[PDB]
Motif scaffolding. Sequence first.
Motif, short mmCIF file in Angstrom:
data_model
loop_
_atom_site.label_atom_id
_atom_site.label_comp_id
_atom_site.label_asym_id
_atom_site.label_seq_id
_atom_site.Cartn_x
_atom_site.Cartn_y
_atom_site.Cartn_z
N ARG A 181 -7.56 6.09 2.60
CA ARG A 181 -6.83 6.33 1.37
C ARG A 181 -7.56 5.72 0.18
NH1 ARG A 181 -2.03 6.06 1.85
NH2 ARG A 181 -1.94 5.78 4.12
N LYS A 215 -6.29 4.42 -2.63
CA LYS A 215 -5.65 3.19 -3.10
C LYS A 215 -5.44 2.24 -1.93
CE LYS A 215 -5.04 4.92 -7.23
NZ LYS A 215 -5.72 6.21 -7.54
N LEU A 216 -6.16 1.12 -1.95
CA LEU A 216 -6.04 0.08 -0.93
C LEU A 216 -5.12 -1.02 -1.46
CD1 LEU A 216 -9.81 -0.14 -0.03
CD2 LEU A 216 -8.15 1.53 0.75
N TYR A 217 -3.82 -0.71 -1.49
CA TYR A 217 -2.81 -1.67 -1.91
C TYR A 217 -2.17 -2.40 -0.74
CZ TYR A 217 -3.13 0.58 -6.47
OH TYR A 217 -3.59 1.05 -7.68
N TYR A 218 -2.58 -2.10 0.49
CA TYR A 218 -2.21 -2.94 1.62
C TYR A 218 -3.09 -4.18 1.73
CZ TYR A 218 -6.17 -0.61 3.89
OH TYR A 218 -7.42 -0.12 4.20
N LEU A 219 -4.28 -4.17 1.13
CA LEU A 219 -5.19 -5.30 1.25
C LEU A 219 -4.64 -6.54 0.54
CD1 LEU A 219 -8.60 -3.56 0.60
CD2 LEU A 219 -7.72 -4.28 2.83
N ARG A 220 -3.82 -6.35 -0.49
CA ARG A 220 -3.25 -7.50 -1.19
C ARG A 220 -2.45 -8.37 -0.24
NH1 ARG A 220 -0.83 -4.04 -6.37
NH2 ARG A 220 -2.85 -3.43 -7.26
N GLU A 221 -1.63 -7.76 0.61
CA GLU A 221 -0.92 -8.52 1.63
C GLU A 221 -1.89 -9.15 2.63
OE1 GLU A 221 1.85 -9.45 1.34
OE2 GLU A 221 3.13 -8.00 0.32
N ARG A 222 -2.93 -8.42 3.02
CA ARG A 222 -3.89 -8.94 3.97
C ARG A 222 -4.67 -10.09 3.36
NH1 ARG A 222 -4.42 -4.64 7.22
NH2 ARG A 222 -2.44 -3.52 7.41
N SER A 248 -7.86 -9.33 8.52
CA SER A 248 -7.32 -7.99 8.33
C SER A 248 -7.92 -7.32 7.09
CB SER A 248 -5.80 -8.05 8.24
OG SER A 248 -5.38 -9.01 7.29
#
Length: 115
Positions: free
Chosen positions: A95, A97-104, A108
Motif C-alpha cells: 500500500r 500509505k504506510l500508516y501502520y508503521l507509526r504503531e510499529r 516490525s
Amino acid sequence: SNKHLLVQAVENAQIIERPSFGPGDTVVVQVKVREGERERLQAFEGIVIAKRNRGLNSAFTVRKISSGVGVERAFQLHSPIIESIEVKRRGAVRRAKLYYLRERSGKSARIREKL
RNA sequence: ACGUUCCCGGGCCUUGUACACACCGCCCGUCACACCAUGGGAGUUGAUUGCACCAGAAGUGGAUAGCUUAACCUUCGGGAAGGC
C-alpha cells in the motif's frame, strides 16, 4: 490539469527536476538550514511512509527514529528548501500509505527490500 | 485500795518481719506536668527482589530474494570454496 490553464502556466516555471522514487523506500534528503550569516545542509534519512503527487504541490512524508522516538516531516518535493533527494534503499510495500508503521517500533517497522 | 480486763509507760522469755536514723518504719496503684526509648496506627516515601510477559544491539549457528568472486579444478562457458 486540475488547475486552470493560467495557473498551470505559472506552476510549470516553478517545477524543478528531481529523481523519481517510489513509496516505502529509504531516502536521504538535503535540507537547507539557516544558522544566521552562514548556510548549511542537513541530511534527513528515513523511510517514506506516505506520498502525494499533485504536480507542483507534490509532497512526501519521511519518518525516522532518533533517540527512541519517531519524527515525521512532510517535505515538499518542488520547494527550494530541498537541495537534493537520493534513494539509499528501495523497498516494496503493498500500500502507498504506510500508516501502520507509526504503531510499529522496532523489528516490525522494517520494510522488505525490493529487487 | 474487791482487782489486772483496759488508756499510758517499763522488765524478762518465746514468736513473725520486705523495719535497722529502726512503725513517727517500709511501701502500692490511678490522676496532673515535663523529657526519653519503644508497640499498634489511615497513610507518605526509599532500598532490594519472586514470577509471567514484551524486547532483540553486536556476536556466533541453520538456510538462501540476491550481489562481488585472486590462490585449487576448468572443456577457459564455468564449477569448488569463500565473503556480503
